[PDB]
Amino acid sequence: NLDSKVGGNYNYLYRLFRKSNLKPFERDISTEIYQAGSTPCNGVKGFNCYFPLQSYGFQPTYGVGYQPYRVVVLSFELLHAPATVCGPKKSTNLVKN
Amino acid sequence: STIEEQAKTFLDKFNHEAEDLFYQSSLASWNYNTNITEENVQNMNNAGDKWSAFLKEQSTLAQMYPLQEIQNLTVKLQLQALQQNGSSVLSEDKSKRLNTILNTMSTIYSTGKVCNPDNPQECLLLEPGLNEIMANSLDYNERLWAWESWRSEVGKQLRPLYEEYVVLKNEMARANHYEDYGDYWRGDYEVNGVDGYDYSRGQLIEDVEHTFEEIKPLYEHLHAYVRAKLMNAYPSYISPIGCLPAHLLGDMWGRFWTNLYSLTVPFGQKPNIDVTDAMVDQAWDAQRIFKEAEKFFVSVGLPNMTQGFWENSMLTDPGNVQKAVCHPTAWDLGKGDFRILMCTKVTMDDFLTAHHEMGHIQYDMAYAAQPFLLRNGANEGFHEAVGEIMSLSAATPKHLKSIGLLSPDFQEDNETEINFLLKQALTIVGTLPFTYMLEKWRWMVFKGEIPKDQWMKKWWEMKREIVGVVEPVPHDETYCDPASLFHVSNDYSFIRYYTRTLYQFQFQEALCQAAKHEGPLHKCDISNSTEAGQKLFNMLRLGKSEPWTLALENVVGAKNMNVRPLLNYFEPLFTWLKDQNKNSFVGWSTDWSPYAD
């Protein structure tokens, strides 16, 4: 109901091809052309040279299973630094005497 | 470094790009079919040419990956369709003229008409105009005027266009290393790469010929039954040992005999099963017709329909302002977008049609997890066969009494069931000889065994032998019967109709044995039985990614087509036809002619 629009949204891309698998918690923004074989590429599309970034088709008419989902991943890591963020507290009534 | 790694990389990226353009190409055709506008006619040609030229550009990189170095079966099948260059193998002059002949023959068929001999001012087009009149017309001259005069301005006019259609399509198969163009359509059944399951292309010729031999004793008893009913009308023109006229088959080309079911009713003193009058009292609309059919797929274990399917369905035609084609068709766009364009009225046929149209959508959901290149039926006959077996279980009296259409006190006996098996036989039994006749004729002409002058000489000669039909007026080589046909002129597969009958009856017998149904096969109902849907779901998700001979064994246990389910399902009708034909002559002769005495 938000991202998908009539005509398609090409702003959101993804990396289809990479020479190996990424390490945990790694981000690679490199746009360098992926080389499948031994044929030289040098940033020019051609035989065994493919542009890795591909587009997500976004329209409201697509099926429910393939609808894009906005995913928010919270990374919980406990380091040796002093703890700060904590859960919410609760305040009760005050009585005297 | 290996070719398999380079071929798989090309296929991984191609599946994404080909799926994006095919969706927009199918969406442009959807907006054009549902709404006639000047913007949609341009978007269909624009999006259609972008997807058509996309396969041509990717075919250049597809031929650079030989299949000899690939040991994977799924990779070679994805590169099998991409290896063919299509019309690019033809010369520049023959490639441009090929689309011209196809568009010319399709335009003449749509714009063709036969003016009334009695009313020269009124001129009615074939579809719907002439196709509707030929159904209910009982007159001898009225049917002959529309049947004979059509091929005069069409069959004779399309002859030079058909001669060019044969020459252009033969040069494409020769560049593709095919024996002829008749072998091109037989390449859809081709299976290679697996030991013992290999299926040769030339084997189909012997398969359709051998299975048709066991069809003859069933077809001869039905052909003599229809001839005995129409013998009293014209005893002079219709001989007991002769053949039936071509124009009296119930329509133009004699594809289906259902139009003759009115006069062929064995017992007119008993009511017939009809859900039309039952839905009127229940007050049902087009919204609940698809809803009740969706629960039929849930009772067998198959998944339900997505919310976008029922919301985007087109339930009617809003007058002439926005016009949509009422011909039922299941359109599959992609990425889970499923839509059906049909004009839904309240009739007994629309109930069985809803199960057929939703059968194609339910069939696409199983293999939808496969890549775009692997999304397809295993052959051309499995597409429509899956939707028919869903309608066969719905037409049974058991399923009608379940939801309340048919009264539970309705008497079901031999007299009621024989009347029902005869209606299906006219559509089924009458189709097999006619489909085997015209398809075998095309294979002989495309091969070169029949000279151009003998086209019509062998057409009617082999017609009395197969379907037992003789022409009232003899025709010369100028006329061409297949040129006016919808499937031949539009370059669609005509073989899918013959094999569909054999595939749908095999699946009907196998699913009823898995659910432990007893009695005759036409009494079987697959509703409420979840055991049969599980065995079928395994094959439905395979598609063409696996050999159709291997996927067929996982259901019926057979590696090829078999006539046994064809005879068993028609066995109750075959026993009744044999007793009624004792007073007549079983079979026909090819030496009888209406103009030769």
XYZ file of C-alpha atoms in Angstrom:
694
model
C 0.000 0.000 0.000
C 3.031 2.328 0.085
C 6.116 1.261 -1.876
C 4.324 -0.339 -4.827
C 2.877 2.114 -7.349
C 1.336 2.006 -10.811
C 4.047 1.576 -13.432
C 6.719 -0.014 -11.242
C 9.342 1.296 -8.829
C 12.951 0.863 -9.971
C 14.517 2.761 -7.052
C 15.015 -0.376 -4.922
C 17.690 -2.708 -6.309
C 19.483 -5.850 -5.151
C 22.763 -7.657 -5.793
C 22.034 -10.786 -7.824
C 25.583 -12.037 -8.491
C 28.733 -12.108 -6.377
C 31.935 -14.135 -6.637
C 31.459 -15.565 -3.126
C 29.167 -15.400 -0.095
C 29.119 -12.381 2.202
C 30.350 -12.591 5.778
C 27.914 -12.006 8.662
C 27.101 -8.312 9.157
C 28.839 -7.172 5.964
C 27.624 -4.526 3.504
C 29.031 -4.332 -0.036
C 28.003 -1.297 -2.103
C 30.467 -1.987 -4.936
C 28.887 -1.580 -8.377
C 31.770 -3.343 -10.168
C 30.586 -5.582 -12.995
C 30.481 -9.252 -12.031
C 32.689 -11.525 -14.145
C 31.269 -15.037 -14.462
C 33.960 -16.539 -16.691
C 37.495 -15.711 -17.778
C 36.386 -13.174 -20.406
C 37.580 -9.637 -19.549
C 34.800 -7.153 -18.776
C 36.329 -3.770 -17.817
C 32.949 -2.254 -16.964
C 31.456 -3.050 -20.391
C 28.445 -5.342 -20.697
C 28.862 -8.332 -22.976
C 29.543 -12.052 -23.078
C 30.065 -13.419 -19.539
C 29.763 -9.849 -18.202
C 26.594 -9.010 -16.280
C 25.400 -5.969 -14.353
C 24.731 -7.343 -10.849
C 22.050 -4.911 -9.670
C 18.497 -5.859 -10.651
C 15.179 -4.115 -10.054
C 12.172 -5.077 -7.944
C 8.914 -4.794 -9.858
C 6.450 -3.005 -7.550
C 2.757 -2.699 -8.439
C -0.389 -3.312 -6.360
C -1.528 -5.923 -8.907
C 1.062 -8.546 -7.916
C 0.097 -11.561 -5.842
C 0.061 -11.446 -2.061
C 2.961 -13.868 -1.599
C 5.373 -11.754 -3.651
C 4.271 -8.406 -2.198
C 7.270 -6.497 -0.788
C 7.623 -6.584 2.993
C 9.488 -3.882 4.900
C 11.801 -5.745 7.287
C 13.275 -4.138 10.411
C 16.022 -6.308 11.917
C 17.164 -5.430 15.443
C 20.721 -6.552 16.241
C 21.152 -7.350 19.947
C 24.817 -7.442 20.996
C 26.105 -7.357 24.581
C 29.597 -5.854 24.785
C 31.887 -4.957 27.687
C 30.682 -1.338 27.638
C 28.370 -0.154 30.437
C 24.748 -1.082 29.774
C 22.400 1.804 28.994
C 19.285 0.768 27.068
C 16.869 -1.171 29.277
C 13.246 -2.257 29.203
C 10.394 -0.033 30.363
C 9.719 0.395 34.067
C 6.479 0.654 36.054
C 5.496 3.144 38.756
C 3.037 2.237 41.514
C 1.079 4.280 44.045
C 2.701 5.940 47.060
C 1.303 5.281 50.540
C 2.369 6.780 53.870
C 1.898 6.073 57.593
C 35.522 -21.986 -15.318
C 33.288 -24.784 -16.578
C 30.574 -24.188 -19.167
C 27.941 -25.310 -16.648
C 28.871 -22.403 -14.369
C 28.678 -19.965 -17.289
C 25.383 -21.431 -18.524
C 23.759 -21.359 -15.081
C 24.859 -17.744 -14.588
C 23.175 -16.783 -17.868
C 20.006 -18.606 -16.805
C 19.928 -17.050 -13.325
C 19.925 -13.515 -14.743
C 17.650 -14.338 -17.694
C 14.888 -15.665 -15.425
C 14.570 -12.248 -13.773
C 14.616 -10.135 -16.942
C 12.302 -12.404 -18.941
C 9.811 -12.496 -16.055
C 9.611 -8.697 -15.750
C 8.926 -8.058 -19.441
C 6.482 -10.963 -19.784
C 4.362 -9.530 -16.961
C 4.082 -6.103 -18.599
C 3.420 -7.765 -21.960
C 0.606 -9.868 -20.492
C -0.717 -6.864 -18.561
C -0.968 -4.787 -21.744
C -2.982 -7.580 -23.365
C -5.208 -7.766 -20.277
C -6.111 -4.069 -20.369
C -6.788 -4.354 -24.111
C -9.074 -7.384 -23.773
C -11.081 -5.978 -20.854
C -11.303 -2.458 -22.319
C -11.162 -1.367 -25.963
C -9.279 1.939 -26.174
C -6.761 3.622 -28.449
C -4.212 3.616 -25.613
C -4.470 -0.116 -24.885
C -4.073 -1.169 -28.529
C -0.772 0.724 -28.672
C 0.441 -0.586 -25.302
C -0.192 -4.186 -26.374
C 1.906 -3.762 -29.522
C 4.643 -1.872 -27.662
C 4.914 -4.279 -24.725
C 4.451 -7.215 -27.094
C 7.347 -6.206 -29.342
C 9.656 -5.530 -26.387
C 9.173 -9.086 -25.111
C 9.332 -10.605 -28.604
C 12.596 -8.839 -29.453
C 13.962 -9.701 -25.997
C 13.976 -13.427 -26.774
C 15.660 -12.652 -30.102
C 18.511 -10.720 -28.469
C 19.029 -13.357 -25.768
C 19.020 -16.123 -28.390
C 22.392 -14.862 -29.638
C 24.033 -15.534 -26.266
C 22.090 -18.789 -25.824
C 23.624 -20.488 -28.877
C 27.115 -19.753 -27.491
C 26.658 -22.317 -24.668
C 26.777 -25.825 -26.181
C 24.753 -28.483 -24.375
C 27.432 -31.166 -24.824
C 29.462 -29.867 -21.860
C 26.415 -29.603 -19.556
C 25.710 -32.718 -17.483
C 22.664 -31.209 -15.735
C 19.210 -32.090 -17.043
C 17.420 -28.992 -15.725
C 19.989 -26.694 -17.355
C 19.709 -28.252 -20.821
C 15.909 -27.975 -20.741
C 16.065 -24.254 -19.941
C 18.501 -23.823 -22.845
C 16.436 -26.029 -25.176
C 13.869 -23.332 -25.979
C 16.464 -20.543 -25.962
C 18.686 -22.389 -28.448
C 16.093 -22.016 -31.212
C 16.341 -18.682 -33.024
C 12.673 -18.728 -34.040
C 12.158 -16.760 -37.245
C 15.732 -15.417 -37.211
C 16.910 -18.474 -39.161
C 14.718 -17.425 -42.092
C 15.904 -14.906 -44.660
C 15.068 -11.226 -44.240
C 12.566 -11.426 -47.105
C 10.887 -14.581 -45.791
C 10.871 -13.351 -42.181
C 8.949 -10.148 -42.936
C 6.477 -11.864 -45.277
C 5.798 -14.570 -42.674
C 4.062 -12.182 -40.270
C 2.144 -10.686 -43.203
C 0.544 -13.985 -44.240
C -0.365 -14.805 -40.633
C -1.992 -11.394 -40.162
C -3.752 -11.600 -43.536
C -5.273 -15.047 -42.980
C -6.379 -14.008 -39.488
C -7.986 -10.824 -40.827
C -9.899 -12.612 -43.598
C -11.229 -15.148 -41.088
C -12.468 -12.346 -38.823
C -13.842 -10.157 -41.635
C -15.223 -13.058 -43.678
C -18.980 -13.287 -44.118
C -21.621 -15.053 -46.207
C -24.469 -12.937 -47.547
C -27.938 -14.468 -47.384
C -28.895 -15.882 -50.815
C -32.533 -14.934 -50.202
C -31.600 -11.538 -48.680
C -28.570 -10.150 -50.557
C -28.696 -6.981 -48.436
C -28.252 -8.775 -45.101
C -24.745 -10.238 -44.788
C -23.866 -12.087 -41.580
C -20.350 -12.744 -40.319
C -19.239 -16.267 -39.439
C -18.674 -15.678 -35.717
C -21.078 -15.347 -33.953
C -23.522 -14.922 -36.815
C -23.081 -18.029 -38.944
C -21.840 -20.245 -36.098
C -25.057 -19.621 -34.147
C -27.452 -20.289 -37.039
C -25.766 -23.558 -38.054
C -26.328 -24.942 -34.541
C -30.144 -24.935 -34.452
C -30.814 -25.073 -38.213
C -32.673 -28.242 -39.225
C -33.044 -27.236 -42.890
C -31.126 -29.012 -45.642
C -30.733 -26.024 -47.976
C -30.172 -23.377 -45.290
C -27.230 -25.321 -43.857
C -25.769 -26.046 -47.301
C -25.891 -22.392 -48.383
C -23.770 -21.262 -45.429
C -21.425 -24.269 -45.564
C -20.724 -24.281 -49.313
C -20.584 -20.538 -50.010
C -18.095 -19.894 -47.190
C -15.170 -21.796 -48.721
C -15.932 -20.193 -52.102
C -14.755 -16.729 -51.018
C -12.524 -18.007 -48.181
C -11.143 -21.471 -48.905
C -10.480 -20.584 -52.538
C -9.082 -17.173 -51.560
C -6.776 -18.543 -48.842
C -5.290 -21.181 -51.170
C -2.421 -18.973 -52.464
C -1.925 -17.767 -48.891
C -1.841 -21.358 -47.620
C 0.715 -22.378 -50.257
C 3.024 -19.614 -49.038
C 2.344 -20.661 -45.439
C 3.668 -24.155 -46.179
C 6.838 -23.010 -47.957
C 7.843 -20.435 -45.335
C 7.396 -22.739 -42.337
C 9.282 -25.609 -43.995
C 12.431 -23.511 -44.429
C 12.444 -22.798 -40.688
C 12.474 -26.488 -39.741
C 15.276 -27.237 -42.210
C 17.512 -24.605 -40.605
C 16.627 -26.067 -37.183
C 17.707 -29.575 -38.322
C 14.120 -30.869 -38.352
C 12.782 -33.285 -40.956
C 9.787 -31.065 -41.787
C 7.380 -28.587 -40.223
C 5.125 -31.462 -39.170
C 7.980 -32.683 -36.979
C 8.209 -29.250 -35.324
C 4.928 -29.715 -33.457
C 6.011 -33.258 -32.563
C 9.094 -31.815 -30.843
C 6.984 -30.744 -27.865
C 6.742 -34.394 -26.774
C 10.476 -34.960 -27.331
C 12.272 -36.489 -24.334
C 16.027 -37.075 -24.168
C 18.730 -37.288 -21.517
C 17.231 -40.020 -19.302
C 17.907 -43.728 -19.802
C 14.804 -45.690 -20.795
C 12.386 -42.734 -20.787
C 13.559 -41.349 -24.149
C 10.662 -40.600 -26.513
C 11.317 -40.189 -30.234
C 9.510 -37.573 -32.303
C 8.497 -40.075 -34.985
C 6.941 -42.313 -32.327
C 3.909 -40.007 -32.073
C 2.822 -40.956 -35.604
C 2.615 -44.629 -34.622
C 1.066 -43.763 -31.245
C -1.905 -41.781 -32.573
C -2.433 -44.442 -35.250
C -2.370 -47.443 -32.897
C -4.587 -45.898 -30.209
C -7.113 -44.898 -32.883
C -7.540 -48.538 -33.949
C -9.156 -49.426 -30.613
C -11.284 -46.270 -30.893
C -12.922 -47.555 -34.106
C -15.243 -50.167 -32.489
C -16.471 -47.517 -30.045
C -16.883 -44.864 -32.753
C -18.635 -47.148 -35.257
C -21.445 -47.912 -32.807
C -21.972 -44.214 -32.058
C -21.780 -43.157 -35.713
C -24.436 -45.741 -36.591
C -26.623 -44.537 -33.711
C -26.608 -40.929 -34.938
C -27.186 -42.045 -38.536
C -30.233 -44.103 -37.525
C -31.888 -41.043 -35.972
C -31.360 -38.842 -39.046
C -32.169 -41.630 -41.526
C -35.937 -41.053 -41.387
C -35.538 -37.389 -42.373
C -33.640 -37.940 -45.653
C -33.562 -41.664 -46.487
C -32.444 -41.006 -50.073
C -29.343 -38.936 -49.293
C -28.464 -40.832 -46.090
C -27.627 -44.497 -46.772
C -27.606 -47.060 -43.938
C -24.187 -48.325 -45.071
C -23.152 -44.878 -46.340
C -21.876 -41.723 -44.675
C -23.491 -38.658 -43.136
C -23.448 -35.281 -44.917
C -20.822 -32.737 -43.915
C -23.181 -29.798 -43.314
C -25.462 -31.726 -40.918
C -22.743 -32.384 -38.307
C -24.178 -29.535 -36.189
C -21.690 -26.780 -37.076
C -19.407 -25.642 -39.891
C -16.413 -27.973 -39.501
C -18.081 -30.780 -37.539
C -15.857 -30.443 -34.475
C -18.495 -31.285 -31.844
C -21.735 -33.253 -32.171
C -23.286 -31.734 -29.020
C -25.661 -29.708 -31.214
C -27.294 -33.014 -32.223
C -27.965 -34.085 -28.620
C -31.525 -32.738 -28.857
C -32.752 -35.218 -31.481
C -30.587 -38.142 -30.291
C -32.134 -38.356 -26.788
C -32.772 -42.081 -26.165
C -35.630 -41.503 -23.694
C -37.656 -38.302 -23.849
C -40.125 -39.456 -21.199
C -37.633 -38.883 -18.366
C -36.347 -35.568 -16.969
C -32.770 -34.410 -17.486
C -30.330 -33.019 -14.931
C -30.153 -29.222 -15.152
C -28.803 -26.787 -12.555
C -30.023 -23.677 -14.403
C -33.508 -23.622 -12.868
C -32.053 -24.561 -9.467
C -29.708 -21.559 -9.320
C -32.580 -19.182 -10.133
C -34.528 -20.115 -6.999
C -31.332 -19.994 -4.930
C -30.614 -16.485 -6.318
C -26.892 -16.813 -6.979
C -24.674 -14.228 -8.674
C -21.261 -14.346 -10.333
C -19.592 -13.753 -6.954
C -20.734 -17.004 -5.319
C -20.208 -19.153 -8.434
C -16.425 -18.903 -8.118
C -16.693 -19.116 -4.321
C -18.440 -22.500 -4.339
C -15.916 -23.756 -6.905
C -13.039 -22.625 -4.675
C -14.222 -24.927 -1.883
C -13.957 -27.829 -4.338
C -10.193 -27.287 -4.496
C -10.009 -27.118 -0.693
C -11.741 -30.480 -0.199
C -9.048 -32.224 -2.278
C -6.168 -30.599 -0.369
C -5.200 -28.000 -2.968
C -4.535 -24.424 -1.789
C -7.252 -21.790 -2.022
C -7.286 -18.665 -4.204
C -5.443 -15.485 -3.266
C -7.343 -12.332 -2.338
C -6.072 -10.626 -5.488
C -7.561 -13.367 -7.663
C -11.179 -12.887 -6.568
C -10.855 -9.087 -6.383
C -9.481 -8.622 -9.918
C -11.911 -11.063 -11.560
C -14.157 -9.680 -14.311
C -17.673 -10.963 -13.656
C -19.655 -9.320 -16.490
C -19.547 -6.941 -19.459
C -20.659 -3.373 -18.594
C -22.603 -2.820 -21.803
C -21.059 -1.488 -25.000
C -19.211 1.418 -23.338
C -16.432 -0.873 -22.082
C -16.407 -4.090 -24.118
C -14.679 -7.307 -23.073
C -14.328 -10.646 -24.832
C -16.817 -13.158 -23.430
C -14.783 -16.158 -24.617
C -13.645 -17.895 -21.398
C -9.868 -17.750 -21.029
C -7.468 -18.091 -18.092
C -4.745 -15.438 -18.351
C -1.536 -16.009 -16.372
C 0.541 -12.815 -16.130
C 3.202 -13.648 -13.559
C 4.552 -13.163 -10.052
C 1.371 -14.509 -8.493
C -1.002 -12.367 -10.579
C -3.906 -14.590 -11.665
C -6.922 -13.256 -13.564
C -9.756 -14.675 -15.667
C -11.802 -12.780 -18.271
C -15.239 -14.325 -18.787
C -18.841 -13.148 -19.094
C -20.692 -15.001 -16.332
C -24.416 -15.633 -16.763
C -26.621 -18.161 -14.965
C -26.563 -21.402 -16.979
C -25.736 -25.061 -16.472
C -22.651 -24.745 -18.701
C -21.174 -21.778 -16.815
C -21.116 -23.928 -13.673
C -18.883 -26.541 -15.312
C -16.927 -23.776 -17.061
C -16.083 -22.130 -13.725
C -14.345 -25.329 -12.618
C -12.464 -25.389 -15.932
C -11.319 -21.758 -15.820
C -10.283 -22.055 -12.169
C -8.558 -25.339 -13.018
C -5.911 -23.547 -15.073
C -5.268 -21.093 -12.230
C -5.074 -23.927 -9.701
C -2.717 -25.745 -12.083
C -0.370 -22.742 -12.275
C -0.060 -22.478 -8.477
C 1.783 -25.794 -8.086
C 4.765 -25.128 -10.370
C 4.790 -21.356 -9.733
C 7.867 -21.921 -7.535
C 9.841 -22.898 -10.652
C 11.862 -20.385 -12.696
C 10.159 -18.531 -15.533
C 11.718 -20.894 -18.075
C 10.425 -23.882 -16.075
C 6.881 -22.487 -15.688
C 4.749 -24.303 -18.287
C 2.838 -27.524 -18.836
C 4.801 -30.681 -19.547
C 3.172 -30.641 -23.000
C 0.407 -28.901 -24.951
C -2.266 -31.403 -23.882
C -1.857 -31.079 -20.117
C -2.991 -27.431 -20.118
C -6.690 -28.026 -20.807
C -6.799 -31.591 -19.442
C -6.328 -30.432 -15.840
C -9.359 -28.143 -16.041
C -11.579 -30.804 -17.609
C -11.127 -33.450 -14.897
C -12.314 -30.828 -12.409
C -15.527 -30.309 -14.393
C -16.148 -34.042 -14.870
C -16.429 -34.597 -11.113
C -18.750 -31.586 -10.838
C -21.126 -32.850 -13.547
C -21.751 -36.059 -11.593
C -25.071 -36.256 -9.694
C -23.169 -36.954 -6.461
C -21.456 -33.555 -6.385
C -24.676 -31.759 -7.355
C -26.587 -33.270 -4.426
C -23.793 -32.258 -2.033
C -24.180 -28.473 -2.339
C -27.940 -28.606 -2.922
C -28.341 -27.990 -6.662
C -29.981 -31.351 -7.397
C -32.776 -32.634 -5.185
C -31.766 -35.591 -2.967
C -34.897 -37.487 -4.072
C -33.874 -37.426 -7.750
C -33.969 -40.953 -9.157
C -30.598 -42.075 -10.537
C -30.736 -45.196 -12.708
C -29.519 -46.554 -16.045
C -32.001 -44.500 -18.079
C -30.744 -41.249 -16.535
C -27.037 -42.116 -16.750
C -27.091 -43.362 -20.355
C -28.647 -40.034 -21.348
C -25.765 -38.217 -19.638
C -23.024 -40.407 -21.126
C -24.376 -39.752 -24.626
C -24.029 -35.973 -24.295
C -20.376 -36.291 -23.273
C -19.742 -38.836 -26.039
C -20.825 -36.402 -28.763
C -18.191 -33.922 -27.566
C -15.522 -36.525 -26.700
C -15.946 -39.541 -28.990
C -16.748 -37.333 -31.975
C -13.606 -35.251 -31.451
C -10.971 -38.010 -31.653
C -11.456 -39.158 -35.288
C -11.869 -35.563 -36.479
C -8.708 -34.452 -34.662
C -6.723 -37.479 -35.852
C -7.939 -36.834 -39.409
C -6.953 -33.186 -39.845
C -3.673 -33.446 -37.927
C -2.496 -36.458 -39.940
C -3.436 -34.610 -43.135
C -1.238 -31.660 -42.156
C 1.696 -33.974 -41.413
C 1.398 -35.554 -44.871
C 1.166 -32.240 -46.745
C 3.997 -30.604 -44.792
C 6.163 -33.664 -45.495
C 5.559 -33.530 -49.256
C 3.828 -36.883 -49.796
C 0.692 -35.180 -51.184
C 1.114 -32.947 -54.270
C -0.685 -29.612 -54.308
C -3.334 -31.001 -56.676
C -4.218 -33.953 -54.410
C -4.848 -31.863 -51.266
C -8.630 -32.053 -51.660
C -8.474 -35.455 -53.374
C -6.915 -37.066 -50.291
C -8.889 -34.864 -47.874
C -12.368 -36.220 -48.615
C -11.072 -39.688 -49.531
C -9.518 -40.189 -46.087
C -12.510 -38.458 -44.468
C -14.960 -41.253 -45.287
C -12.458 -43.757 -43.873
C -11.903 -42.009 -40.523
C -14.981 -39.993 -39.519
C -17.262 -41.356 -42.251
C -18.271 -38.023 -43.797
C -18.885 -37.419 -47.508
C -19.346 -34.074 -49.260
C -22.735 -33.257 -50.828
C -21.069 -31.080 -53.497
C -17.693 -32.303 -54.827
C -14.864 -29.781 -54.555
C -11.786 -29.258 -56.714
C -8.260 -28.339 -55.602
C -9.201 -24.641 -55.369
C -10.965 -25.069 -52.026
C -8.981 -25.569 -48.818
C -10.850 -26.872 -45.773
C -8.134 -26.328 -43.094
C -7.487 -22.773 -44.330
C -10.791 -21.585 -42.847
C -10.273 -23.420 -39.544
C -9.558 -21.254 -36.506
C -6.576 -23.262 -35.256
C -4.807 -23.778 -38.595
C -5.159 -20.181 -39.801
C -4.015 -18.755 -36.444
C -1.061 -21.191 -36.160
C -2.201 -22.959 -32.986
C -1.539 -26.559 -31.983
C -4.221 -28.891 -33.341
C -2.719 -32.055 -31.806
C -3.441 -31.002 -28.206
C -7.114 -31.956 -28.617
C -6.499 -35.623 -29.479
C -4.039 -36.384 -26.675
C -6.106 -34.428 -24.131
C -8.889 -37.028 -24.216
C -6.458 -39.842 -23.400
C -4.694 -37.860 -20.657
C -7.864 -36.726 -18.866
C -9.352 -40.231 -18.642
C -6.131 -41.726 -17.266
C -6.135 -39.128 -14.485
C -9.844 -39.729 -13.855
C -9.276 -43.451 -13.270
C -6.146 -43.025 -11.130
C -7.610 -40.470 -8.711
C -10.701 -42.613 -8.115
C -8.570 -45.658 -7.279
C -6.544 -43.666 -4.738
C -9.675 -42.565 -2.849
C -11.111 -46.126 -2.901
C -14.231 -45.353 -4.929
C -16.316 -48.347 -6.005
C -18.682 -48.858 -8.914
C -18.720 -47.323 -12.388
C -16.271 -44.534 -13.127
C -18.898 -41.921 -14.019
C -20.294 -42.314 -10.487
C -16.941 -41.299 -8.977
C -16.575 -37.958 -7.196
C -13.229 -36.618 -5.973
C -14.778 -34.138 -3.525
C -14.073 -34.468 0.213
C -11.264 -36.913 -0.668
C -7.835 -35.553 0.275
C -5.924 -38.704 -0.722
C -6.260 -38.142 -4.479
C -5.185 -34.494 -4.355
C -1.865 -35.383 -2.732
C -0.792 -37.838 -5.441
C -1.753 -35.363 -8.174
C -0.042 -32.363 -6.548
C 3.359 -34.033 -6.974
C 3.056 -33.988 -10.774
C 1.375 -30.575 -11.031
C 4.418 -28.824 -9.540
C 6.873 -30.498 -11.937
C 5.808 -28.787 -15.158
C 8.109 -29.379 -18.111
C 11.213 -29.384 -15.884
C 10.823 -33.187 -15.853
C 9.989 -35.554 -18.735
C 6.251 -35.937 -19.251
C 6.750 -39.703 -19.533
C 8.310 -39.737 -16.056
C 5.676 -37.489 -14.465
C 2.903 -39.593 -16.010
C 4.249 -42.753 -14.352
C 4.024 -41.130 -10.905
C 0.222 -40.894 -11.262
C -1.252 -43.604 -13.502
C 1.815 -45.853 -13.593
C 1.891 -45.756 -17.404
C 4.762 -44.531 -19.577
C 2.588 -43.681 -22.605
C -0.993 -43.181 -23.743
C -3.490 -45.991 -23.177
C -7.035 -46.597 -24.422
C -8.127 -48.679 -21.397
C -9.541 -45.678 -19.447
C -11.262 -44.534 -22.650
C -13.155 -47.829 -22.983
C -13.965 -48.330 -19.291
C -15.532 -44.898 -18.773
C -17.610 -45.370 -21.948
C -18.309 -49.061 -21.219
C -21.871 -48.510 -19.861
C -22.715 -46.584 -23.040
C -20.936 -49.058 -25.334
C -23.104 -51.934 -24.084
C -26.319 -50.002 -24.765
C -25.270 -48.885 -28.257
C -24.414 -52.449 -29.302
C -27.941 -53.705 -28.578
C -29.655 -50.809 -30.379
C -27.479 -51.173 -33.504
C -28.352 -54.848 -34.062
C -31.211 -53.802 -36.360
C -28.816 -51.561 -38.334
C -25.426 -52.014 -40.002
C -22.388 -51.398 -37.793
C -19.816 -49.418 -39.762
C -19.816 -47.481 -43.015
C -18.430 -47.766 -46.539
C -16.220 -45.306 -48.412
C -17.657 -46.157 -51.854
C -20.968 -44.331 -51.272
C -21.534 -40.766 -52.476
C -24.677 -38.599 -52.492
C -24.118 -37.439 -56.090
C -22.951 -40.869 -57.340
C -25.734 -43.432 -57.736
